[PDB]
Amino acid sequence: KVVLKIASIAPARSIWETELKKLSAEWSEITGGLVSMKFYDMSSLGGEREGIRKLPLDGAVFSCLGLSELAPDSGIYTLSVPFLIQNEKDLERVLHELREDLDRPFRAAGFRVITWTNAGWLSFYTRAPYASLGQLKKQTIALVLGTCFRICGFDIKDAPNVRLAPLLKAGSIDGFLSVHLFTWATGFYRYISYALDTKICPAVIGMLISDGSWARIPSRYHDAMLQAATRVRQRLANNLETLDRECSNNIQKAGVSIVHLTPQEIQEWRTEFAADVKRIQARLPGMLNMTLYEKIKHLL
Amino acid sequence: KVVLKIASIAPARSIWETELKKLSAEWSEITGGLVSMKFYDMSSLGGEREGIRKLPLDGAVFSCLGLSELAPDSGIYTLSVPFLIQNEKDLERVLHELREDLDRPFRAAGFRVITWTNAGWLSFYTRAPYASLGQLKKQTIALVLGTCFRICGFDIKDAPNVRLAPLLKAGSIDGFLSVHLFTWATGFYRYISYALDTKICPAVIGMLISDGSWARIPSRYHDAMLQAATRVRQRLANNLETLDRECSNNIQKAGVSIVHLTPQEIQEWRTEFAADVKRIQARLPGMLNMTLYEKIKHLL
Amino acid sequence: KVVLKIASIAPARSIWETELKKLSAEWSEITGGLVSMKFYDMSSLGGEREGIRKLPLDGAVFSCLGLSELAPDSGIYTLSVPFLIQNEKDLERVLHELREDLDRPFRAAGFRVITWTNAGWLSFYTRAPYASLGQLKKQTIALVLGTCFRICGFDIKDAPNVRLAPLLKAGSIDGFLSVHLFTWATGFYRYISYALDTKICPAVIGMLISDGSWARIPSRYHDAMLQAATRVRQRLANNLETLDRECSNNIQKAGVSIVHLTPQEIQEWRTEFAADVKRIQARLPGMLNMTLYEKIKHLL
Amino acid sequence: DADFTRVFTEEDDLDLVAQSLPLVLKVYEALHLQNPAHRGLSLAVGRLYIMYANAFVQTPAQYLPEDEFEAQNEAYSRARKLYLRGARYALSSLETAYPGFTREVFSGDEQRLHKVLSRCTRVDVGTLYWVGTGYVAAFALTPLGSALPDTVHAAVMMLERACDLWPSYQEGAVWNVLTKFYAAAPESFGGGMEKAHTAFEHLTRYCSAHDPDHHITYADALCIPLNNRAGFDEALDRALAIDPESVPHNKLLVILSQKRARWLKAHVQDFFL
Amino acid sequence: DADFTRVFTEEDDLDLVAQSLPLVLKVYEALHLQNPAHRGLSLAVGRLYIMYANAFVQTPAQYLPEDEFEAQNEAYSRARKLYLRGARYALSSLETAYPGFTREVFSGDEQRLHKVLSRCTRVDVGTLYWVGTGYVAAFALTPLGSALPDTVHAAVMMLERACDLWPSYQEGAVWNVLTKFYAAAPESFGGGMEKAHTAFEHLTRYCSAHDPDHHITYADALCIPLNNRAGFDEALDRALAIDPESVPHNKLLVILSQKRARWLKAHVQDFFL
Amino acid sequence: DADFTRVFTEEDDLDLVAQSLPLVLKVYEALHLQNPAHRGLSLAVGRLYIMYANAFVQTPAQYLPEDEFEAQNEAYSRARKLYLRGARYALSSLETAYPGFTREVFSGDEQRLHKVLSRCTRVDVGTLYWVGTGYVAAFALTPLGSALPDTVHAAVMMLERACDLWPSYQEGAVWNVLTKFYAAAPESFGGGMEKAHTAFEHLTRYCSAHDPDHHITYADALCIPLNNRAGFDEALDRALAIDPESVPHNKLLVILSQKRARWLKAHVQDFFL
């Protein structure tokens, strides 16, 4: 009987796109075929924001663009504080032990969180190298999330995904901020000599279903169902590691020097980043949950 | 575990034959495969009457021949009063809003009615045309149901399905009473110059299952089950319209003039028919339910 | 969720091997796919005894070698008292009406008996013929179960399945004790001129599942489940008759004289066997259940 | 070639035959379109299409579970279409011999129909059989109201013609088809049980003792509708008694037929009581 | 042969075609390995592999239930591999005419790429189309990150070259493929909606009125992503309006295409709202 | 032809091979019935039947879910029959060279058996292998009690003969088959683990480093029954380590074999503990 429309932000041939089906079929069978998921594309319905007003469609997969669009009270963008969550394991612990705090803001918008996961680890892809974070901050790097980095002292240009190549070839950009799969799969690696391999922070997503539609689901099924969404989260975080190493080696075989930070440097960057954290808190409180912030540092 | 034998009166390649399976598979799956329907042919077991004494076999699909064979208290033949129910929509309303009155007589014979539906709309297929119902009544037309028409002033010969052609070619019949699918599919249209397209009355059927066998079915399933039998009823009444227009156009392409009555004429026939209704009530009360009769006129 | 490991003593292409799957699939579907059976070979895990200490693996199919290995209190070998159970029907009655007494000893070892069945009917395959049981007892016949026959006055050599041929060709054996499928399928019939067709006693097996693992199974399912294991038992006992007649006719077509005992002789052997029964009771009490013994004679 | 048809007809593996045949038809068909006038070819490709619809399209579908009935209906429709195509192929060999044949036989004028059939010889019998058979097979898979009564009548007249020219033809095979037809049609459609039994009697004069089909035909075209389980059961036992290894030719069709008898016996419960 | 390709292209039975073709490819392939230099052969086997992946590998998989998605993924992977193989076959006809072609076109040097394409004539257009098409089909079945952006770009440049030499080619077919590509790629991958519409306009200049494909292409490459149900619905009605019996050539592909339109209409609910 | 066998053996698509082969066997078979005396043909069709039963009949069935076991049993029976047919085909090439061969080898007289095998030369080895192999494959799919112990013994004696004439034959392939046989038979059936290991040692002298089979054979004919998971796991890793693109010949059989290793690894839980 029950069929759910999830507007999906997952890419065409991506592992997310595949994982979302593996879940939909994993659920269907668990409900005995009664309940399932039909995916709709967010570009098609007018973008992440236009998707919001359609909650017609009961459920969504969101990046922090829309995830913090319906819960300004959301901590969220807190997780992408630089060097806060610096590796795949640390991210697991944080989505696991910390679920309820991440969740609650969204029941304040009237949604149940199905599961959390990662779109990728931000990296810098640059024409020149850098001795320190500061020097890197001098470079004009192109990329919501961007306005934050600007604060930390990152010179940033806000540009469409297209104009990147022209702007590089023009010397109007020294590089850009992105994930490995993007810079590989687009061929944009061709225009860049250096890629940071040291993870900065996760880009978190994002699956929500409407409180009402989550009602049509019989009490019985909720548990193993939601344990299926967490199975998924874990599979991805693994596969994503594999895919990122692949994308790195392909970037490297292609002649790009791969930048690696030493623990020395990593602590040096952590500190310079923690100082900016104070600064953001002033220049916007709503984009950081300070108790979520600290509870994460506690956790490791 | 449970398997039901339904003696079926549905024709070889007919939509009924197909619809009865679509239901049997629709039920089976709904019961999770526990309960289903195996169809048996009523010619094979000795006809509609011989099928009765076998209620061994628990269930049946019946025309008013057998349907009024086990419930002489049945209204039934009431629905085929001429011009009473004159179109497909009116028949729906009557099988729907009126279910319980149609049903009850058969729980007095110890059966539950699964669903009602139509074998077709009686029409006249005639060698000559007619200005009025009366003139038509003069013609010797060949066809239980027949003895009633005789009353209304219809000259009727009771003849096997075979001898129709010979009798036409012999001038011993001016035409015959039937449904469009019969007169088309048999080629009998070849022997006739005129076909009435204006519907007279439905030939109703007829699906019953034994009260006992309907017991083996768990309480849980009865509802969506019986809502499946009503889904079927509706599909047919649609498909039957399509099939009848097809059969009409094929009859017409084949050179038969298609007779259409004007609303003027239709009311003229209604009246002449209502007068006969009084007459039947005297010459047999058991073949008309007078409160079912009137309740239908009420309804439209 | 639930998957059971049954160490199986059933032969490679045998009917048992096939029947054990027909049951595993019969159960699976009955549980709706939740519970099933994965079979493991007892040779592979170190024999019938080594399998015992693995009850890791929860369940087993056992001959009286292991069946009486974990319930020395078992009657068991009682069923193979010669001429006690002399035909396939009598064996059914005894596994059926007598279930609880056969069973109980194994709940004293902490197991539930799924079902009982037969590996075959012991026969003698011999180079020379015999006028009486006594004369046969003189012959050196090769074969746990063997030590018992020795008591009755059977000259017995305990030899591996290999050395049979050499020992026959050497005149160090006059014949051997076995089942028809063995003597046919091995070609060992070639070395023998006479095969007893008159059944002596069944070789009983043997399926047990651990009390704990039988817990993971929901109360709901146990019944129709255990009625499936009894369906199996019955199918085999039939098929085994067919297979044995086949094996006999093939043995006979191959030139071996088939020995048949007359009822006269059969009673003569019964008596000589009953006398030995007293003798065993002394030379080991634990290998015969005397109340199970007598309750069987009662039964027929 | 004779030894090529042998690897098919004397085959015991139905999957193998089914996987190999489609291309063989495609070839014979391509050939036929090169040589529209070659009569043995026209007939050969038509015969193949028909035999294939039966064995590898209709038959397998009949063994589908009663809830797969939608899949089963597609298949019936597929097979109906193959029967018609194979029937037009065969008929086009008649049109090659007797130009204007098709237009007469499908006229709807009984005289024109019979005249044109009157000019047919013992040489045409195999062709008449395959065309008649192909249409009748199609008609049996055709939704009520979708047939053309004249087309059916024509097809049946072709078979009756065949019987007239060569009654004993192919160990009685024309009667077999005719028996199924008369038993499944009303006394008002040109069928009946009297006709059906009459055709069956003839069939038993000419049919082989190694052929399972006529037993099966007896069981399910006669015994079922007359509700005779006994006759039904005994006939199938007769059909199943035949050893495929012991038959001279057409092992495949024997094997196919016995597969059906087995099935019919399994389901006797659904045809009787 | 011409009448041999006819029994396939003018066929209405998809199963039949699917069961017969594999051997036909195997033969054409074995032939090609005998004659690596024969250009018409190289292209012919490549074209067959591509058309087969589409119709009998990818297409059927698209009709799988959304829980059969693992089976559906294997199939997509199977089809991706057949597309590549058929594309290398076709490309090897270009390598026969223009030795060093492959090494240039796949250089990753835009100039080398364009130079080598500049030396192509109207005689190469069919070859360019099939290779370009084969790679683009593959790319569409290729896991994100597994493609090589230069390979895609090369393939697309081949199609754009074809358009330049022979815009009207095969009733517009190069535009059809191009339209699907531009609409499914980001303005950053060499695609876009503006390009896509432009290619479609051209397609409608050259395309046949009996061809369902361009309607279907319009429905699902344009109307869906732009969330136009109306356009989507009307286009499919246009596609389904065409009578397969009435088309001059390529009945099979019409039938295939209408099967898809039917399906698309059934599921409109999943693409809109 | 050599380039024709190439499009099959060097193929990576199992479905394609499976859809194309049946007709190829049908042809080779029809040919063989034309030329019963042609020995290379007799052997060629027999070899094909055997290889086909294995890859496309038995193998796929082994991958069926444990409740599909009825379907799996039919398939095993199908494959058993194809193995026997292919074995009689190959044996009939021996009967052509040595009239009276069959009657001797199947006599049941050990001397007659060995005499007749004694007259065999290095020229017969491939034939001995295929026949021996075909029967042993059949026996493994044969219901207990349905075999004939002499037939098996004969088949095994043929393989042992082959080893004697040409130990290194086909990179050791006779030992491979022998190893599976000895390990699966009782010390009372002419088998054993000692024999099995001995045959395997020989196999490893002659076998290729690019062949996955011998690793797989080691895993599941030796390691399982001896309950060695380690050996089982390491061997399969070895089998899966081989690159199919890097092998000189028989890509298809490598791909087939790796499909099996993957499966074996997935199910290790069912063979151990």
mmCIF file with all atom_site columns, C-alpha atoms in Angstrom, chain F residues 176-252:
data_model
loop_
_atom_site.group_PDB
_atom_site.id
_atom_site.type_symbol
_atom_site.label_atom_id
_atom_site.label_alt_id
_atom_site.label_comp_id
_atom_site.label_asym_id
_atom_site.label_entity_id
_atom_site.label_seq_id
_atom_site.pdbx_PDB_ins_code
_atom_site.Cartn_x
_atom_site.Cartn_y
_atom_site.Cartn_z
_atom_site.occupancy
_atom_site.B_iso_or_equiv
_atom_site.pdbx_formal_charge
_atom_site.auth_seq_id
_atom_site.auth_comp_id
_atom_site.auth_asym_id
_atom_site.auth_atom_id
_atom_site.pdbx_PDB_model_num
ATOM 1  C CA . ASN F 1 176 ? 42.727 -32.555 -12.727 1.00 0.00 ? 176 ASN F CA 1
ATOM 2  C CA . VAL F 1 177 ? 39.774 -34.779 -13.515 1.00 0.00 ? 177 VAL F CA 1
ATOM 3  C CA . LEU F 1 178 ? 41.386 -37.730 -11.810 1.00 0.00 ? 178 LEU F CA 1
ATOM 4  C CA . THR F 1 179 ? 42.003 -35.682 -8.670  1.00 0.00 ? 179 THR F CA 1
ATOM 5  C CA . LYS F 1 180 ? 38.338 -34.758 -8.369  1.00 0.00 ? 180 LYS F CA 1
ATOM 6  C CA . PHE F 1 181 ? 37.381 -38.379 -8.891  1.00 0.00 ? 181 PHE F CA 1
ATOM 7  C CA . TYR F 1 182 ? 39.707 -40.043 -6.337  1.00 0.00 ? 182 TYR F CA 1
ATOM 8  C CA . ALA F 1 183 ? 38.897 -37.566 -3.628  1.00 0.00 ? 183 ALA F CA 1
ATOM 9  C CA . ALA F 1 184 ? 35.150 -38.064 -4.045  1.00 0.00 ? 184 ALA F CA 1
ATOM 10 C CA . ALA F 1 185 ? 35.230 -41.871 -4.060  1.00 0.00 ? 185 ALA F CA 1
ATOM 11 C CA . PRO F 1 186 ? 35.739 -44.329 -1.176  1.00 0.00 ? 186 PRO F CA 1
ATOM 12 C CA . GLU F 1 187 ? 38.926 -46.359 -0.817  1.00 0.00 ? 187 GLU F CA 1
ATOM 13 C CA . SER F 1 188 ? 36.500 -49.171 -1.730  1.00 0.00 ? 188 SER F CA 1
ATOM 14 C CA . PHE F 1 189 ? 35.379 -47.571 -5.023  1.00 0.00 ? 189 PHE F CA 1
ATOM 15 C CA . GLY F 1 190 ? 38.856 -47.189 -6.497  1.00 0.00 ? 190 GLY F CA 1
ATOM 16 C CA . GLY F 1 191 ? 39.346 -43.780 -4.890  1.00 0.00 ? 191 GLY F CA 1
ATOM 17 C CA . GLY F 1 192 ? 41.032 -42.310 -1.839  1.00 0.00 ? 192 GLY F CA 1
ATOM 18 C CA . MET F 1 193 ? 42.828 -39.285 -0.482  1.00 0.00 ? 193 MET F CA 1
ATOM 19 C CA . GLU F 1 194 ? 46.254 -40.778 -1.041  1.00 0.00 ? 194 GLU F CA 1
ATOM 20 C CA . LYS F 1 195 ? 45.535 -41.314 -4.737  1.00 0.00 ? 195 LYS F CA 1
ATOM 21 C CA . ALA F 1 196 ? 43.900 -37.912 -4.954  1.00 0.00 ? 196 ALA F CA 1
ATOM 22 C CA . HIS F 1 197 ? 46.947 -36.101 -3.558  1.00 0.00 ? 197 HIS F CA 1
ATOM 23 C CA . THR F 1 198 ? 49.242 -38.086 -5.815  1.00 0.00 ? 198 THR F CA 1
ATOM 24 C CA . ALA F 1 199 ? 47.289 -37.026 -8.924  1.00 0.00 ? 199 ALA F CA 1
ATOM 25 C CA . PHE F 1 200 ? 47.326 -33.451 -7.708  1.00 0.00 ? 200 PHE F CA 1
ATOM 26 C CA . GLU F 1 201 ? 51.081 -33.414 -7.298  1.00 0.00 ? 201 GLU F CA 1
ATOM 27 C CA . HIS F 1 202 ? 51.361 -34.469 -10.945 1.00 0.00 ? 202 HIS F CA 1
ATOM 28 C CA . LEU F 1 203 ? 48.840 -31.866 -11.975 1.00 0.00 ? 203 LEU F CA 1
ATOM 29 C CA . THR F 1 204 ? 51.032 -29.165 -10.402 1.00 0.00 ? 204 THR F CA 1
ATOM 30 C CA . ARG F 1 205 ? 54.037 -30.359 -12.419 1.00 0.00 ? 205 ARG F CA 1
ATOM 31 C CA . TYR F 1 206 ? 52.272 -29.750 -15.731 1.00 0.00 ? 206 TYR F CA 1
ATOM 32 C CA . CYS F 1 207 ? 49.706 -27.033 -15.040 1.00 0.00 ? 207 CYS F CA 1
ATOM 33 C CA . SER F 1 208 ? 49.918 -23.415 -16.151 1.00 0.00 ? 208 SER F CA 1
ATOM 34 C CA . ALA F 1 209 ? 50.435 -20.507 -13.750 1.00 0.00 ? 209 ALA F CA 1
ATOM 35 C CA . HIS F 1 210 ? 47.599 -18.661 -15.525 1.00 0.00 ? 210 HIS F CA 1
ATOM 36 C CA . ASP F 1 211 ? 45.114 -21.482 -14.872 1.00 0.00 ? 211 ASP F CA 1
ATOM 37 C CA . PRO F 1 212 ? 42.727 -20.858 -11.906 1.00 0.00 ? 212 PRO F CA 1
ATOM 38 C CA . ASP F 1 213 ? 41.211 -24.321 -12.073 1.00 0.00 ? 213 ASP F CA 1
ATOM 39 C CA . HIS F 1 214 ? 43.916 -26.239 -10.245 1.00 0.00 ? 214 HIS F CA 1
ATOM 40 C CA . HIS F 1 215 ? 43.732 -23.836 -7.304  1.00 0.00 ? 215 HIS F CA 1
ATOM 41 C CA . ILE F 1 216 ? 39.979 -24.222 -7.215  1.00 0.00 ? 216 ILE F CA 1
ATOM 42 C CA . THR F 1 217 ? 40.261 -28.003 -7.518  1.00 0.00 ? 217 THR F CA 1
ATOM 43 C CA . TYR F 1 218 ? 42.646 -27.918 -4.588  1.00 0.00 ? 218 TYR F CA 1
ATOM 44 C CA . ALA F 1 219 ? 40.274 -25.803 -2.506  1.00 0.00 ? 219 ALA F CA 1
ATOM 45 C CA . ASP F 1 220 ? 37.123 -27.825 -2.938  1.00 0.00 ? 220 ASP F CA 1
ATOM 46 C CA . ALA F 1 221 ? 38.224 -31.391 -3.676  1.00 0.00 ? 221 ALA F CA 1
ATOM 47 C CA . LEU F 1 222 ? 40.938 -31.468 -1.043  1.00 0.00 ? 222 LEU F CA 1
ATOM 48 C CA . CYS F 1 223 ? 40.640 -28.649 1.494   1.00 0.00 ? 223 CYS F CA 1
ATOM 49 C CA . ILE F 1 224 ? 36.925 -28.977 2.140   1.00 0.00 ? 224 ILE F CA 1
ATOM 50 C CA . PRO F 1 225 ? 36.727 -32.719 2.899   1.00 0.00 ? 225 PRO F CA 1
ATOM 51 C CA . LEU F 1 226 ? 39.870 -32.386 4.978   1.00 0.00 ? 226 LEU F CA 1
ATOM 52 C CA . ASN F 1 227 ? 38.296 -29.371 6.617   1.00 0.00 ? 227 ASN F CA 1
ATOM 53 C CA . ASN F 1 228 ? 41.132 -26.977 5.898   1.00 0.00 ? 228 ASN F CA 1
ATOM 54 C CA . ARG F 1 229 ? 39.680 -23.489 5.657   1.00 0.00 ? 229 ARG F CA 1
ATOM 55 C CA . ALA F 1 230 ? 43.113 -21.851 5.454   1.00 0.00 ? 230 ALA F CA 1
ATOM 56 C CA . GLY F 1 231 ? 44.191 -23.911 2.456   1.00 0.00 ? 231 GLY F CA 1
ATOM 57 C CA . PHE F 1 232 ? 40.715 -23.363 1.078   1.00 0.00 ? 232 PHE F CA 1
ATOM 58 C CA . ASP F 1 233 ? 40.948 -19.587 1.464   1.00 0.00 ? 233 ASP F CA 1
ATOM 59 C CA . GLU F 1 234 ? 44.513 -19.158 0.222   1.00 0.00 ? 234 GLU F CA 1
ATOM 60 C CA . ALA F 1 235 ? 43.938 -21.321 -2.861  1.00 0.00 ? 235 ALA F CA 1
ATOM 61 C CA . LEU F 1 236 ? 40.910 -19.311 -3.933  1.00 0.00 ? 236 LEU F CA 1
ATOM 62 C CA . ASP F 1 237 ? 42.904 -16.112 -3.487  1.00 0.00 ? 237 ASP F CA 1
ATOM 63 C CA . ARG F 1 238 ? 45.442 -17.593 -5.844  1.00 0.00 ? 238 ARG F CA 1
ATOM 64 C CA . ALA F 1 239 ? 42.715 -18.454 -8.312  1.00 0.00 ? 239 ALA F CA 1
ATOM 65 C CA . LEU F 1 240 ? 41.262 -14.966 -8.094  1.00 0.00 ? 240 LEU F CA 1
ATOM 66 C CA . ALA F 1 241 ? 44.664 -13.278 -8.343  1.00 0.00 ? 241 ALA F CA 1
ATOM 67 C CA . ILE F 1 242 ? 45.011 -14.216 -12.062 1.00 0.00 ? 242 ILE F CA 1
ATOM 68 C CA . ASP F 1 243 ? 44.144 -11.466 -14.595 1.00 0.00 ? 243 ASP F CA 1
ATOM 69 C CA . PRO F 1 244 ? 41.883 -12.760 -17.419 1.00 0.00 ? 244 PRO F CA 1
ATOM 70 C CA . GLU F 1 245 ? 43.125 -10.013 -19.750 1.00 0.00 ? 245 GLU F CA 1
ATOM 71 C CA . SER F 1 246 ? 46.659 -11.297 -19.179 1.00 0.00 ? 246 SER F CA 1
ATOM 72 C CA . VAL F 1 247 ? 46.010 -14.926 -20.121 1.00 0.00 ? 247 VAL F CA 1
ATOM 73 C CA . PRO F 1 248 ? 47.110 -16.215 -23.569 1.00 0.00 ? 248 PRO F CA 1
ATOM 74 C CA . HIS F 1 249 ? 44.132 -18.451 -24.296 1.00 0.00 ? 249 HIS F CA 1
ATOM 75 C CA . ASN F 1 250 ? 40.888 -19.650 -22.761 1.00 0.00 ? 250 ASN F CA 1
ATOM 76 C CA . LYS F 1 251 ? 39.793 -16.324 -21.251 1.00 0.00 ? 251 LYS F CA 1
ATOM 77 C CA . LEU F 1 252 ? 36.201 -17.664 -21.037 1.00 0.00 ? 252 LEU F CA 1
#
